[PDB]
Design a protein around this ligand. Structure first.
Ligand SMILES: CCCCCCCCCCCCCCCCCC(=O)OC[C@H](CO[C@@H]1O[C@H](CO[C@H]2O[C@H](CO)[C@H](O)[C@H](O)[C@H]2O)[C@H](O)[C@H](O)[C@H]1O)OC(=O)CCCCCCCCCCCCCCCCC
Ligand code: CLA
Ligand code: CLA
Ligand code: CLA
Ligand SMILES: CC(C)=CCC/C(C)=C/CC/C(C)=C/CC/C(C)=C/CC/C(C)=C/CC/C(C)=C/CC/C(C)=C/CC/C(C)=C/CC/C(C)=C/CC1=CC(=O)C(C)=C(C)C1=O
Ligand SMILES: CC(C)=CCC/C(C)=C/CC/C(C)=C/CC/C(C)=C/CC/C(C)=C/CC/C(C)=C/CC/C(C)=C/CC/C(C)=C/CC/C(C)=C/CC1=CC(=O)C(C)=C(C)C1=O
Ligand SMILES: CCCCCCCCCCCCCCCC(=O)OC[C@H](COP(=O)(O)OC[C@@H](O)CO)OC(=O)CCCCCCCCCCCCCCC
Ligand SMILES: CCCCCCCCCCCCCCCC(=O)OC[C@H](COP(=O)(O)OC[C@@H](O)CO)OC(=O)CCCCCCCCCCCCCCC
Ligand code: HEC
Ligand SMILES: CCCCCCCCCCCCO[C@@H]1O[C@H](CO)[C@@H](O[C@H]2O[C@H](CO)[C@@H](O)[C@H](O)[C@H]2O)[C@H](O)[C@H]1O
Ligand SMILES: CCCCCCCCCCCCO[C@@H]1O[C@H](CO)[C@@H](O[C@H]2O[C@H](CO)[C@@H](O)[C@H](O)[C@H]2O)[C@H](O)[C@H]1O
Ligand SMILES: CCCCCCCS[C@@H]1O[C@H](CO)[C@@H](O)[C@H](O)[C@H]1O
Ligand SMILES: CCCCCCCS[C@@H]1O[C@H](CO)[C@@H](O)[C@H](O)[C@H]1O
Ligand code: OEX
Ligand SMILES: [Ca+2]
Ligand SMILES: [Ca+2]
Ligand SMILES: [Cl-]
Ligand SMILES: [Cl-]
Ligand SMILES: [Cl-]
Lengths: 245, 37, 334, 137, 152, 30, 35, 38, 97, 112, 49, 97, 34
């Protein structure tokens, strides 16, 4: 049925969607602890980006609030692959190796504030509960990943300033005092941690394919140290193909 | 259009100009302090 | 008369203060849409990711621009030549981020201005004039086509269309020079001859007719009152003007035929500007200015610079700095 | 300044022997380099891999050494990576791959010597411009 | 990638993929400024294309030397060059005598199409005027505007 | 204040266009 | 001294708008025809 | 967005039909001299 | 067509003198200022904002980057009496190019 | 006056900052030996830098003025002074009193 | 005359030549930002006008 | 207290030698025999606690080991700098000619 | 934005002073006998 080509897909939006499994896919994929495994394809399709509002002094409980995506259907992570280790307590650990494992995303808050982020699972290491003798709809994976700077080190600001390139001062204000401009002149490269949960909702025990929902938390862009990042929560759907390797 | 019959010329004589300018300048001289505050 | 007949009579009426006409039926709505969007965008639009690198450029007055720096910013390089109407965006916020106003404005404008040209033909026909004013207008029109449509087509993106703004215009010029060495292209050179010469001949015609106005007024009134709208008699003495100009240069370099003069006045700027437009429209497909980089070499093979090589150094400056975060590979191929 | 016999004298091999090219050989070398090579190697750079240039000092540190006529002639027959480790005729013009790089089909041994002489002579003339890229234009 | 780069995961300076990114509808496309050209299709590139666009496994494992050759050939014969047929960017030095036939054909035909539009306008406007009888000018004794009401 | 000033000048220009067109001194033949 | 930064233009317009109005009315009165 | 698209489509079609039918409505005869050009 | 039109031929032909003559005269005044480097180079408000806010970008800021390229890349050959030597590493360049 | 700045590299050779010509709104920071040979700079691209103040161990010592007898070796400070040396002699300024914006203006000689 | 007389020398006047004049334009952009100057802009409007 | 980490690194051995943990891969072109084969292996198996650990890359031929031995004096190691190794920058750092 | 604080009054008077001049001259022209 179907087996769609690039010409069937192109311009539809389907290329930014993860594969799904139909409602009958509620089985169990057995894990032989003597066998090595891989995830051949991990795909993450975000459906909501929430940004933690930043409250006034109060120390009220700040809420994550909805946002509008402005960068179009360019948000999914896909073609990710890595080792799926069977650990000595029967837990599984996915160690991400490679793939299209980041997307820059810009979402807009009520009132217009734009929040860029590097939506990612770079260097993901995620583990299940112990004694996972079959992957089932009770399985989940929880783990951590790295969130490098949204811009890399060559990036030049609008006045030509950068970390690995560019001017190191505000050359249009040749005799300004340098101290109040230090935070804009001295570029810094952020590297922080993010956290993710994958909740399996569907398993085809025959094919090694699983799908479900995810929720990830990470920091947004800090503009190479010029401002504080926001906290972002990403929710969506995922698909993975598990294989003996 | 035939002309409008309700039109009238307007006048301001010199004395009125001087009276008017005195009013405006003095009011300014009075209110300017409050405008600068 | 029936309704359609009456409507047609009104549309084509020679008595409307502003002529409508069939061209005008398309022109009026498209120009109004382009104008209203431009005004609102120029005032209030948020920053636009012109280069598709999530680096939004602020064009509007409310977002930190003045009249000189302000612009409506071209649509995103991510879009390229794709058609991006409002209804292809998930929201107006997205539409705005991606530079949707630019496309709406330039497409409505180019359609409307094309109909402005048609309308010039149309009214000339209704009034029993000769038909070619519209042909003179084809010169600026072609130039607007070149910078808003043809150049984008050639380069594969509306992101390389001229921005709708004063500084934006200069950016387009400097990058065009880097990429095409336009100054060294004979069609831009013809364009310069066209506008410098149009200005020269404008001043010359104005000065010569003004020189030769017939005395009809006194020293305490404007000489302009010496001409009355619709008088039958010419108001200057062309024989005197020719007498003057023919001695300034020599006799056979001066026009004694007003028709021939006024034709030259039309043709010189129009033809030059057509070549300007064709310069932009052909550099659109990267047939560029003359390249004499290292053309002069000594007996050993040392490069002996000429002024072309100095131009080249300036061009290099422009090239290496423009869109400083957009290139990942060594050659700028579009 | 002139294109002298001294300028036109370049290393033949790694063992100290030189060859003095004629002015006709220099001109042929330029023509042939333009014909077969300059689409990638204009001005001594490499457009499809700017990390490797045709500077004499770079060629000297290649394996085997390419800073002489014999090394360059051999390169045009059986090109290798910079460390000598892989044969790259399938992706680099050579006599060996003249089937897939048809401009190589008409090049004679004489022609390879001329191209080689051009690569060695040109930096003697142009200095840092040779392999310098746009910075030195 | 031959040098060891993981090209799917390589983040460029802007945060977009240095080599690979998504089109606005999600298809995997080449990055850099060529993002504008993702609608391009050609026989040397299509073998790398999957249902969702450029396929990372095909990229990592299936690129043939003929494809490398062809891409190198085409990159270095891009249709850019001067009026005197110096190939390359406008700042390139003399060396390569090249202007693409595509540039010659597109520019010539633009010029000709343009002047033909001008000729269309010239002759259509003249045909109209001649048919109606005023192509030589306005009759002094029957000037149409003189019979029309004033605009104001 | 800057933005207001720019927009104000522009809006005056637009009003001027209106008056210059619709409330011009009408041209009269002799 | 930290004065209100709009006082200058407020004062200038306060003087100029009504003064101009009166000057306009006076001059066009003088230019009218006499008896 | 769907409603906007349809609205604009209808607007554009309306004006284009006026342009075409208008020029089809005896346009050569709408001039101040010779009208029998058919 | 346009809403306004000339009605006075003497005015028209005077205006044809005035426009290009006045334009040229204005351009000359500017060049007299450039004799002294008394330029319209910058908008100070723009520079204050951009120096403090690395996300703020206009076509005005973009053009100055082009200008900085022009100066660095052209000066050594265009001004030989200054004996400028600008090492590769100091030359302003964007990514790749 | 802060005093006269003398730059030196790690070998102890005196280096000289290239001064800004009046034409230039901005100018790079390049230091040469007495013969004009480049010895240190502030790089734009870092990846192939060979003359950085860090690499060359550039120091600055002051003679005369408020900084007389002082030497600075930390690269950020030495660079700061090199940036000012392009303007010639180095001065301490009060920028607070007039809310000065750091951008050069002409004198009455210019305006006249 | 005036321009070079304010500058260091006649060196910086325009050289009498086609390419030389082009170099003078590009010099004025890069060094003077002359496009930004309202007096040049009034020039432009008079010439194009 | 804000520091540019790349400038700072230029004051370490990273500024003097090929840093096996940080330097971009084109730098291996400086010495005979290292590029592209060994260069790829080195970058791929980084980081190293000491320069000599480069000799323990699995699968090296005897020839490769001797080439590495001959070039240890041109190598160093310093702590991995995120700014220099992110973005695939060790394989392509946005510099061409 | 840190604009020149005299730009507003400079702009206002630049418009108003000559505009007023012209309006005064126009209106007194109209009020002259026809
Ligand atoms: C008031 C008056 C107003 C005046 C306004 C000005 C209007 C235009 C003026 C233009 C003047 C042209 C000057 C001619 C310059 C020239 O000598 O040009 C010489 C060039 C060739 O130049 C040579 O081009 C060579 C090309 O090199 C390349 O090719 C070489 C082998 O050919 C080598 O392989 C080399 O390695 C490789 O780089 C090198 O650059 C040489 O150094 C270089 O001298 O001629 C060519 O290109 C020939 C083909 C193009 C000529 C096109 C002329 C266009 C005129 C348009 C007018 C339209 C009118 C319409 C009427 C209807
Ligand atoms: C004369 C009036 C007119 C015209 C010609 C246009 C034209 C356009 N508008 Mg605008 N617009 C108008 C009035 C008009 N507008 C008004 C009054 C409004 C306010 C409601 C708008 C609001 C509006 C918005 C919000 C947007 C547009 C957009 C567009 C573009 C796409 C239109 C489209 O897809 O329809 C296509 C419809 C057809 C092809 C149907 C035509 C059917 C006929 C019978 C067939 C003939 C077709 C043939 C090729 C035409 C040539 C005929 C020739 C031989 C004479 C285009 C530039 C979009 C845009 O700018 O995108 C960037 C956009 O987002 N417009
Ligand atoms: C800018 C382009 C342009 C302009 C101003 C004109 C103008 C003119 N044409 Mg020409 N024409 C053109 C292009 C144009 N033409 C092209 C490309 C063709 C080839 C197909 C023709 C073929 C043509 C014929 C067959 C006839 C004319 C005629 C005329 C003249 C009389 C009015 C008329 O019937 O218009 C008709 C106008 C057109 C056919 C095209 C006008 C195009 C502009 C852009 C309007 C676009 C309107 C459209 C509804 C917008 C759709 C928007 C979209 C989103 C749906 C007039 C001088 C008539 C005449 O008297 O000739 C002696 C005549 O019989 N022209
Ligand atoms: C739309 C684009 C455009 C337009 C229309 C202009 C228009 C103008 N620019 Mg500008 N310019 C532009 C873009 C543009 N510029 C850009 C993007 C830049 C980059 C910054 C510049 C940089 C630039 C510079 C550097 C200068 C100009 C100047 C000018 C003015 C030249 C006036 C003139 O004719 O001098 C032509 C020369 C004369 C009128 C002098 C007298 C000539 C005599 C009569 C000639 C006699 C010849 C003789 C008979 C023999 C001929 C022999 C033959 C063999 C040749 C004019 C207002 C000039 C200016 O402002 O001057 C004050 C100037 O110096 N502009
Ligand atoms: C100390 C010593 C030795 C002294 C001796 C002096 C002495 C007595 C010398 C005598 C001997 C002698 C003459 C020697 C000559 C040496 C010599 C050749 C010197 C000059 C060389 C020189 C550089 C000359 C430059 C002149 C020149 C190129 C002029 C321009 C020519 C030219 C292209 C003109 C434009 C022509 C043209 C297309 C014009 C139309 C444009 C235009 C004017 C439109 C408007 C217009 C035109 C009309 O027509 C009328 C009607 C009206 C309304 C009108 O609008
Ligand atoms: C939301 C916001 C704020 C938006 C605005 C954004 C924005 C970018 C705005 C633009 C800002 C702007 C205007 C900038 C430009 C400013 C600028 C540089 C101004 C120049 C000022 C100046 C004093 C220059 C000096 C030179 C000068 C005097 C130039 C004047 C140019 C000029 C007006 C030329 C005439 C143009 C023109 C269209 C004339 C029409 C003439 C006409 C009706 C001809 C028809 C005609 C012809 C005949 O032959 C006969 C016989 C008859 C009968 C007849 O009728
Ligand atoms: C937001 C939009 C704002 C638009 C603003 C435009 C506002 C224009 C305001 C106009 C006000 C003009 C006043 C004209 C003034 C003027 O014409 O005076 C003289 C005028 C004489 O009128 P007559 O009937 O004699 O008619 C003569 C005609 O020529 C007048 O048009 O009498 C009045 O107008 C009555 C008001 C008297 C006010 C006089 C008080 C003067 C006393 C001086 C006070 C200061 C000294 C105090 C010392 C302690
Ligand atoms: C489809 C319809 C499109 C209409 C669009 C609106 C067009 C508006 C045209 C200009 C109206 C203003 C005229 C005032 C002036 C006015 O009423 O002029 C009327 C005047 C009439 O001339 P006369 O010969 O009748 O007058 C002579 C004697 O009275 C002299 O004393 O026309 C000219 O002088 C033509 C030359 C000036 C043309 C100036 C064109 C300016 C274009 C606009 C530039 C500014 C843009 C700023 C953008 C922010
Ligand atoms: C692009 C399609 C090329 C053409 C055409 C030619 N060369 Fe080339 N050359 C090219 C590349 C990409 C490389 C690097 C290859 C690698 O992986 O190592 C080269 C390399 C050389 C070298 C070696 C340079 C060095 O060791 O420093 C030489 C001597 C060389 N090329 C010569 C050469 C000649 C003579 C050519 C025309 C006959 C020629 N090349 C064409 C890419 C391309
Ligand atoms: C910055 C603020 C600007 C404030 C602007 C205030 C504008 C005020 C406009 C005043 C208008 C006066 O309006 C003017 O009235 C006069 C008479 O008085 C009219 O004039 C009429 O009467 C006079 C006197 O009998 C006759 O000589 C004349 O021939 C006749 O037209 C003018 O035709 C009209 O233009
Ligand atoms: C690919 C598309 C296929 C389309 C196939 C069908 C062909 C198109 C046919 C269009 C028919 C229109 O036919 C045309 O209609 C108008 C509108 O009433 C008529 O009506 C007009 O008549 C006169 C003609 O001098 C005008 O003064 C009057 O204003 C108007 O009512 C035209 O005289 C008639 O010729
Ligand atoms: C007819 C008015 C047209 C102008 C509408 C402007 C967009 S609306 C505008 O958007 C900003 C950015 O999101 C908000 O910060 C602001 O609160 C809001 O009023
Ligand atoms: C040891 C201090 C390190 C900082 C060196 C400062 C350079 S000198 C510095 O220059 C400023 C202009 O930018 C002046 O306003 C200020 O007065 C002056 O101290
Ligand atoms: O975008 Mn606007 O400018 Ca036409 O070139 Mn490529 O792309 Mn971008 O670079 Mn150069
Ligand atoms: Ca579950
Ligand atoms: Ca301050
Ligand atoms: Cl740019
Ligand atoms: Cl790119
Ligand atoms: Cl090198």
């Amino acid at each position: 049925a179907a087996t769609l080509t690039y010409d069937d897909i192109v311009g539809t939006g389907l290329a930014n969607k993860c594969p799904t499994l139909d409602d009958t896919a509620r089985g169990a994929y057995p894990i032989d602890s003597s066998q090595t495994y891989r995830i051949a394809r991990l795909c993450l399709q975000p459906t909501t980006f929430l940004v933690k509002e930043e409250p006034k002094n109060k120390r009220q409980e700040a809420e994550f609030v909805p946002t509008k995506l402005v960068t179009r259907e360019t948000t999914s992570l896909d073609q990710i692959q890595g080792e799926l280790k069977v650990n000595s307590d029967g837990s599984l650990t996915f160690v991400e190796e490679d793939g299209i494992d980041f997307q820059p995303v810009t979402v807009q808050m009520a009132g217009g504030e734009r929040i860029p982020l590097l939506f990612t699972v770079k260097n993901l290491v995620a583990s299940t509960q112990p004694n996972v003798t079959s992957i089932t709809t009770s399985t989940d994976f929880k783990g951590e990943f790295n969130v490098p700077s949204y811009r890399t080190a060559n990036f030049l600001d609008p006045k030509g300033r950068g970390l690995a390139s560019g001017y190191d001062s505000a050359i249009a204000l040749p005799q300004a005092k340098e101290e109040e401009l230090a935070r804009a002149n001295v570029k810094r490269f952020s590297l922080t941690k993010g956290q993710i949960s994958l909740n399996v909702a569907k398993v085809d025990g025959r094919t090694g394919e699983i799908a479900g929902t995810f929720e990830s938390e990470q920091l947004s862009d800090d503009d190479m140290g010029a401002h504080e990042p926001h906290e972002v929560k990403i929710q969506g759907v995922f698909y993975a193909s598990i294989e003996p390797a | 259009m035939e002309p409008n019959p309700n039109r009238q010329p307007v006048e301001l004589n010199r004395t009125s100009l001087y009276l008017g300018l005195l009013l405006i300048l003095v009011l300014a001289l009075l209110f300017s302090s409050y405008f600068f505050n | 008369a029936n309704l359609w007949e009456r409507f047609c009579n009104w549309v084509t009426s020679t008595d409307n203060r502003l002529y409508v006409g069939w061209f005008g039926v398309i022109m009026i709505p498209t120009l109004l849409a382009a104008t209203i969007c431009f005004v609102i965008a120029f005032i209030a639009a948020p920053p636009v990711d012109i280069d598709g690198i999530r680096e939004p450029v602020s064009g509007s007055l409310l977002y930190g621009n003045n009249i000189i720096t302000g612009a409506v910013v071209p649509s995103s390089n991510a879009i390229g030549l794709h058609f991006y109407p409002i209804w292809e965006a998930a929201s107006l916020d997205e539409w705005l981020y991606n530079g949707g106003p630019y496309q709406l404005i330039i497409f409505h404008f180019l359609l409307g201005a094309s109909c402005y040209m048609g309308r010039q033909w149309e009214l000339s026909y209704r009034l029993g004039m000769r038909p070619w004013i519209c042909v003179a207008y084809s010169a600026p029109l072609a130039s607007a086509f070149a910078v808003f449509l043809i150049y984008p087509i050639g380069q594969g993106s509306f992101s390389d269309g001229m921005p709708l703004g004063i500084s934006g215009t200069f950016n387009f010029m400097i990058v065009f020079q880097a990429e095409h060495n336009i100054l060294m292209h004979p069609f831009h050179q013809l364009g310069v001859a066209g506008v410098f010469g149009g200005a020269l001949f404008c001043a010359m015609h104005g000065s010569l007719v003004t020189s030769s106005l017939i005395r009809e007024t006194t020293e305490t009134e404007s000489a302009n009152y010496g001409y009355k709208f619709g008088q039958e008699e010419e108001t200057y003495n062309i024989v005197a003007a020719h007498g003057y100009f023919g001695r300034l240069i020599f006799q056979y370099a001066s026009f004694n035929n007003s028709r021939s003069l006024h034709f030259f006045l039309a043709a010189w700027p129009v033809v030059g500007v057509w070549f300007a437009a064709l310069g932009i429209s052909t550099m659109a497909f990267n047939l560029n200015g003359f390249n004499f980089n290292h053309s002069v070499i000594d007996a050993k093979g040392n490069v002996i610079n000429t002024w072309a090589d100095i131009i080249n150094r300036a061009n290099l400056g422009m090239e290496v700095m423009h869109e400083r975060n957009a290139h990942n590979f060594p050659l700028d191929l579009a | 300044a002139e294109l002298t016999p001294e300028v036109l004298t370049v290393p033949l091999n790694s063992e100290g022997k030189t060859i003095t090219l004629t002015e006709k050989q220099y001109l042929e070398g330029k023509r042939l380099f333009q014909y077969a090579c300059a689409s990638c190697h204009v001005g001594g750079i490499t457009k499809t891999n700017p990390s490797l240039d045709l500077r004499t000092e770079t060629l000297a540190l290649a394996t085997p050494p390419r800073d002489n006529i014999e090394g360059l002639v051999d390169y045009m027959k059986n090109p290798t990576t910079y460390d000598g480790e892989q044969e790259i005729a399938e992706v680099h013009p050579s006599l060996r791959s003249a089937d897939i790089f048809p401009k190589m089909r008409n090049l004679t041994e004489k022609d390879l010597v001329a191209i080689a002489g051009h690569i060695l002579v040109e930096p003697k003339i142009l200095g840092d411009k040779w392999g310098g890229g746009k910075v030195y234009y | 990638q031959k040098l060891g780069a993981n090209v799917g995961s390589a983040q460029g300076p802007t945060g977009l993929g240095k080599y690979l990114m998504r089109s606005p509808t999600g298809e995997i496309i080449f990055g850099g400024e060529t993002m504008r050209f993702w609608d391009f299709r050609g026989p040397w590139l299509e073998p790398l294309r999957g249902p969702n666009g450029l396929d990372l496994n095909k990229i990592k494992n299936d690129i043939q030397p003929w494809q490398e050759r062809r891409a190198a050939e085409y990159m270095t014969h891009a249709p850019l060059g001067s009026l005197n047929s110096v190939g390359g960017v406008a700042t390139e030095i003399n060396s390569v005598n090249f202007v693409s036939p595509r540039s010659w054909l597109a520019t010539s035909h633009f010029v000709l199409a343009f002047f033909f539009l001008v000729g269309h306008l010239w002759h259509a406007g003249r045909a109209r005027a001649a048919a109606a009888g005023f192509e030589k000018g306005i009759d002094r004794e029957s000037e149409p505007v003189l019979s029309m009401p004033s605009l104001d | 204040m800057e933005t207001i000033t720019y927009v104000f000048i522009f809006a005056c220009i637009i009003a001027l266009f209106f008056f210059a067109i619709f409330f011009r001194e009408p041209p009269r033949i002799t | 001294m930290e004065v209100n930064q709009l006082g200058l233009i407020a004062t200038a317009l306060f003087v100029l708008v009504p003064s101009v109005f009166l000057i306009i009315l006076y001059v066009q009165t003088e230019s009218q025809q006499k008896s | 967005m769907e409603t906007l698209k349809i609205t604009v489509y209808i607007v554009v079609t309306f004006f284009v039909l006026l342009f075409v039918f208008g020029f089809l409505s005896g346009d050569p005869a709408r001039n101040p001299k010779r009208k029998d050009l058919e | 067509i346009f809403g306004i039109a000339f009605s006075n031929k003497r005015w028209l032909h005077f205006f044809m003198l005035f426009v290009p003559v006045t334009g040229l005269w204005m351009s000359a005044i500017g060049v007299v200022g450039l004799a002294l480097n008394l330029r319209s180079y910058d908008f100070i408000s723009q520079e204050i904002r951009a120096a403090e806010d690395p996300e703020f970008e206009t076509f005005y800021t973009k053009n100055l980057l082009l200008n900085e390229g022009i100066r660095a890349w052209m000066a050594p050959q265009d001004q030989p009496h200054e004996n400028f030597v600008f090492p590769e590493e100091v030359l302003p360049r964007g990514n790749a190019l | 006056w802060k005093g006269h700045a003398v730059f030196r590299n790690k070998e102890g050779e005196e280096l000289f900052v290239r001064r800004m010509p009046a034409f230039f709104e901005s100018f790079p920071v390049i230091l040469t030996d007495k013969n004009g040979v480049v010895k240190a700079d502030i790089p734009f691209r870092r990846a192939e830098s060979k003359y950085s103040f860090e690499q060359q161990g550039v120091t600055v010592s002051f003679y005369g003025g408020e900084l007389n007898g002082q030497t600075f070796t930390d690269p950020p400070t030495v660079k700061s002074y090199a940036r000012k040396a392009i303007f010639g002699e180095i001065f301490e300024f009060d920028t607070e009193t007039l809310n000065s914006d750091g951008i050069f203006r002409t004198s009455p000689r210019g305006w006249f | 005359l005036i321009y070079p007389l304010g500058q260091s020398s006649w060196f910086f006047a325009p050289s009498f030549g086609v390419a030389a004049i082009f170099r003078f334009l590009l010099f004025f952009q890069g060094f003077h930002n002359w496009t930004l100057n309202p007096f040049h802009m009034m020039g432009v409007a008079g010439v194009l006008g | 207290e804000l520091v540019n980490v790349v400038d700072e690194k230029l004051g370490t051995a990273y500024g003097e030698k090929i840093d096996l943990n940080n330097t971009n891969i084109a730098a291996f072109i400086q010495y005979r025999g290292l590029y592209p084969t060994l260069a790829k292996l080195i970058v791929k198996n980084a980081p190293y606690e000491s320069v000599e650990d480069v000799l323990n890359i699995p699968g090296l031929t005897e020839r490769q080991k001797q080439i590495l031995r001959e070039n240890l004096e041109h190598f160093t190691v310093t702590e991995v700098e995120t700014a220099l190794v992110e973005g695939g920058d060790r394989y392509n750092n946005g510099l061409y000619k």
